Copies of this chain bind each other. A is one copy, B any other.
Amino acid sequence: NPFDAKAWRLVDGFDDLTDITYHRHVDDATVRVAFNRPEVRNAFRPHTVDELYRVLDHARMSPDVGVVLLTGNGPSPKDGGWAFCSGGDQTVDVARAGRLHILEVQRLIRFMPKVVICLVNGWAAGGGHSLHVVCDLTLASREYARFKQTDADVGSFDGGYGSAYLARQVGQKFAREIFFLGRTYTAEQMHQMGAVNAVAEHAELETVGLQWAAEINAKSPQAQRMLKFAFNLLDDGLVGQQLFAGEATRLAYMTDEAVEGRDAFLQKRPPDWSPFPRYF
């Protein structure tokens, strides 16, 4: 079992969680967010997404958290099988019911100024596959990671990050193959294609996760933030620019030049820009 209880502490205020677990590391700036429905191959129902959102949002807003490990608990108490996430659990009520609340989760992972590593501990199918795709990094169980894009089998499709963004990891030929055929791939296979960063022994998956997390946390958090947004930038168009530029704005705010401008507004005087040069 990848989960090492000794390493994790419950996060305050999340006692009511049923479909998701949420831990903070005993020492490191890292959290563990996991699907907690192993009986159903960790499929998400609307309540799961609600909880996932809440938890990830909380982790986004925690200034002492640098890295999110996104995984699935297991194994299944019914048949011993391992799953990361098998996707969606298969008049005012109607709009609130049919949701794409998962697309919001995808955006949350994409936009949060911290690194999200998906630890694929088992089946990653449909929406669960797409969650892995959108995470920044992926580490996968050698013995048990299974990647299967089953959307088209049931008449569904992720026409967004699940597919188009996958192509920016494995290239257009591989990505089209993954969706068009819906075959099952191992960790090593996906690693060879370029969607999985590294493969780890099943029982060491979270240990390797934590080691990756610690290497990320050992660097300047400002740089890591800028970096994530630089990687996102052009692919995400104006949104990519908005988030990168937003960090540039924050950096500028801290400078002497920007204090001068702020001062002179409050003091009703003209600003003096003579101390600060025109860099080229």
Which residues of A are in contact with B by a Cβ distance under 8 Å? Answer: 29, 60-66, 90-92, 94-96, 98-100, 103, 106-107, 110-115, 136-138, 151-161, 163-165, 167-177, 179-183, 193-197, 212, 215-231, 233-255, 257-262, 264-266, 270-271, 273-280
Contact = CB atoms under 8 A, between A and B. Distances in A.
B278 A159 contact: no
B156 A63 contact: no
Highest count of chain B CB atoms <10 Å: which of A107, A152, A228: A152
Interface centre among A154, A167, A194 (most CB of B within 10 A): A154
Contact of A255 (B61, B65, B222): B222
Given A112-B280, A155-B271, A172-B231, 17 more contacts: A137-B180, A152-B220, A159-B248, A163-B231, A165-B238, A167-B168, A218-B271, A220-B261, A222-B257, A222-B276, A223-B258, A225-B279, A226-B249, A233-B241, A236-B237, A244-B244, A251-B251
